Amino acid sequence: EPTRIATNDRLSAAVCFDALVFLSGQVPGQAEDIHGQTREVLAKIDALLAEAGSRKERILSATIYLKDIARDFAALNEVWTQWLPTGQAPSRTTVQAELARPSVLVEITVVAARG
Amino acid sequence: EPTRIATNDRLSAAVCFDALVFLSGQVPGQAEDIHGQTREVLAKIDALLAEAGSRKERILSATIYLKDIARDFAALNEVWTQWLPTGQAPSRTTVQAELARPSVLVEITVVAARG
Amino acid sequence: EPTRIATNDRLSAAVCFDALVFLSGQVPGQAEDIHGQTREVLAKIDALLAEAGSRKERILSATIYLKDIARDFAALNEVWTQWLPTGQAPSRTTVQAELARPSVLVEITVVAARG
């Protein structure tokens, strides 16, 4: 009964099952700086929630991976707090981890509620 | 239909949806050592499960982040195994990651079942 | 209402709740190389999905932890893409993290749908 969105032989961008939406970790576009990269990740999450039948106000959890948490946490929080729908922040966890490409400073993995 | 617990402009400590509870990653209080910090994280999880309508016996998954997994895994396991309700350990994953503040040695992210 | 599979005082290999299956992070057997270790992790996930009432075609999410993401991502992807049931890739996130034992190059944490 799972439904899949934008599937290739490595991943589906989203998997939907019983009112839950599981998004693949989202990475930036071509932005090179932490502020722009966080903005681009959040834009991609915005678009995928739409395709998977959810929306920003229905995020349940987000794991935020930063390549350098000491250097970039403050910038991440600036963009994140401005993006979230007012009064509707999800649960979150922010940790340091290198991502699959060295240029990536931030990656975010979301679970959300359909609706 | 999500419900939120202890929300600010960065995160909600918990988000509840369809009998699931999603907790933000929990960090220690003022303890400075791994044993005490793990005890404090688990105390905070205990209290949040209560507010979100769950309990320790209903944990589904826990990601345990250690700043130094080689150094501190044994201590983490001592405190963890003593804290868990008998015979009711959840699924878990323990990995190394630097946390948002350098003093933090351990952070734990829980999903639990309402009830 | 959770059900547990293969429980000890540290973890349950799986916890089942309301049509969801939460697997503990799975680690390799005795393989020493990234290709073999990834194969062994995926074999273990295969077996646990079976015991927990799911199957590979019903994976919802996978966090893939690599000890060295720059060195080993390509090998991970070779084994992963060949293992997945055709056209049915789950959501995934791949990040770098040291695992609990230094010989472990890869660990994978799965959530799946019962059925």
Side-chain angles (χ1 to χ4, degrees), chain C residues 22-40:
Chain C
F22 300 80
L23 298 190
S24 285
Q26 293 304 299
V27 296
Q30 292 181 27
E32 329 177 71
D33 58 309
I34 177 70
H35 285 89
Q37 286 199 356
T38 303
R39 170 178 56 75
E40 295 186 340

Side-chain angles (χ1 to χ4, degrees), chain A residues 43-57:
Chain A
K44 289 186 178 181
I45 287 165
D46 180 359
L48 265 179
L49 292 169
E51 194 72 3
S54 185
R55 60 191 299 165
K56 302 163 175 205
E57 295 86 353

Side-chain angles (χ1 to χ4, degrees), chain A residues 29-69:
Chain A
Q30 292 181 27
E32 329 177 71
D33 59 309
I34 177 70
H35 285 89
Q37 286 199 356
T38 303
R39 170 178 56 75
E40 295 186 340
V41 166
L42 295 177
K44 289 186 178 181
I45 287 165
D46 180 359
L48 265 179
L49 292 169
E51 194 72 3
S54 185
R55 60 191 299 165
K56 302 163 175 205
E57 295 86 353
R58 300 182 70 82
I59 299 169
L60 303 172
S61 62
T63 304
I64 300 174
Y65 300 99
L66 291 170
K67 191 193 187 224
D68 189 330
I69 195 165

